[PDB]
Design a binder for this molecule. Structure first.
Ligand SMILES: CC(=O)N[C@H]1[C@H]([C@H](O)[C@H](O)CO)O[C@@](O[C@H]2[C@@H](O)[C@@H](CO)O[C@@H](O[C@H]3[C@H](O)[C@@H](O)[C@H](O)O[C@@H]3CO)[C@@H]2O)(C(=O)O)C[C@@H]1O
Ligand code: NI
Length: 136
């Protein structure tokens, strides 16, 4: 299995809705600094999942136009993403929030800030990883 182009952008026909799942698998580059997964709506980023190896954190936020909201960084356990290590991310959309699991284990919830779920119809992946698979 080769690699997807990076950054990778693709439409999510129908957008989001309760029970909607988006899966991604890949490998964090050996000296990765950061990478991100965005769920977009028009010119806004409804959900920005941003693991950072330089800060050893997983940042989540929303951007309306060019205005970033308040970041959410809480984690129930140690940073699950590791440089040079393969990973899988599962994003499950519920009515009130997104539930995110990494490597098969739930990591956090993100309450919807952009609530018109069907309008969240674009996925963007960028940064320091080798993207090997996406299931929209
Ligand atoms: C190429 C480029 O310049 N685009 C960047 C953008 C912006 O342009 C940025 O001004 C320059 O990097 O930032 C990107 O990352 C930002 C994003 O992860 C947000 C999410 O909250 O955080 C920004 O950093 C915050 C930092 O976390 C805070 O502690 C600090 O108080 O404020 C910073 C600035 O708001 C990231 O820069 C982006 O995805 O928009 C990366 C792009 O490459
Ligand atoms: Ni496939």
């Amino acid at each position: 299995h080769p690699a997807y182009p990076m950054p990778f952008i693709t439409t999510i026909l129908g957008g989001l809705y309760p029970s909607k799942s988006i899966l991604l698998s890949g490998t964090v580059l050996p000296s990765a600094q950061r990478f991100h997964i965005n769920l977009c709506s028009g010119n806004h980023i409804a959900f920005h999942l941003n693991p950072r190896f330089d800060e050893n954190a997983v940042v989540r936020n929303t951007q309306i136009d060019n205005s970033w909201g308040s970041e959410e960084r809480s984690l129930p356990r140690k940073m699950p993403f590791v440089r040079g290590q393969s990973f899988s991310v599962w994003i499950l959309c519920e009515a009130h929030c997104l539930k995110v699991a990494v490597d098969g284990q739930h990591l956090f919830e993100y309450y919807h800030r952009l609530r018109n779920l069907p309008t969240i119809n674009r996925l963007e992946v960028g940064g320091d990883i080798q993207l090997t698979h996406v299931q929209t």
